[PDB]
Structure 1
Amino acid sequence: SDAHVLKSRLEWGEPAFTILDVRDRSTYNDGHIMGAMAMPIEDLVDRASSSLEKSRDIYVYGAGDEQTSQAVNLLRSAGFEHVSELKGGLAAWKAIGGPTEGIIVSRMQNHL
């Protein structure tokens, strides 16, 4: 799906969707899409299935098209019904003016 759509969802849309950053944790921390949850791909299914309803609208993005498509396949094979890639990932999001948040403590995050 297109970055312009997700940006609209975040500015004006119904609350019911989640953005999943599927890259490395530290990478997420250095910078991620505003609102995205850190679900590194190594434990994506386990983590998503224990935290997200299968009917929830989910947008996924990783470091590149390959990682993103892999994350998307995983979640669906796990029973998730509304998952889509975020074409262009982070880069495409910045290009259209989308905000990026960064963290500056792994125990707070895991315990979380």
Structure 2
Amino acid sequence: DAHVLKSRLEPAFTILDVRDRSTYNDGHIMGAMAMPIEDLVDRASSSLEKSRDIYVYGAGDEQTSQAVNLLRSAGFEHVSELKGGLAAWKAIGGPTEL
């Protein structure tokens, strides 16, 4: 129901997993979306607003920074890197799914 949803929803944010889909399938940050870096710009730009709070993580920090930079170069105004990726996330007991 809509009320149900309205309840769950500061501003909207989205978590992007830029690793390969297969890796995503083995496990990812809960709610994160699979957008392999190869098609990141196209998939991100076609589905989100440039003002969306976006949290990104790849297999390493270099891949994470490449992705973050790509998004910004594509007009995204609020992109942040998730240092440590999935590993650091799991270390603070962050929810994951597969």
| Structure-2-length-normalised TM-score | 0.88
Q: Say if 1:49 and 1:98 are closer, same or farther in 2 by CA, change over 3 A.
A: same
How many pairs were matched up? 98
TM-superposition CA deviations, 1:14-64 (whole Å, max 9, x none):
460000000000000110000000000000000000001000000000000
Q: Say if 1:57 and 1:77 are closer, same or farther in 2 by CA, change over 3 A.
A: same
Give the share of equivalent positions with the same residue, in percent.
100
Q: Say if 1:69 and 1:46 are closer, same or farther in 2 by CA, change over 3 A.
A: same
- Contact 1:3–1:96 under 8 Å retained in 2: no
Q: Say if 1:6 and 1:22 are closer, same or farther in 2 by CA, change over 3 A.
A: farther
Q: Which runs of 5+ in 2 are unaligned?
A: none
Offset, 1:9: 12
Q: Say if 1:72 and 1:4 are closer, same or farther in 2 by CA, change over 3 A.
A: farther
Offset, 1:89: 0.6
Q: Say if 1:61 and 1:7 are closer, same or farther in 2 by CA, change over 3 A.
A: farther
Offset, 1:90: 0.2
Offset, 1:7: 20
| Structure-1-length-normalised TM-score | 0.77
Offset, 1:99: 1.4
Q: Say if 1:8 and 1:42 are closer, same or farther in 2 by CA, change over 3 A.
A: farther
TM-superposition CA deviations, 1:70-94 (whole Å, max 9, x none):
0000000000000010011100000
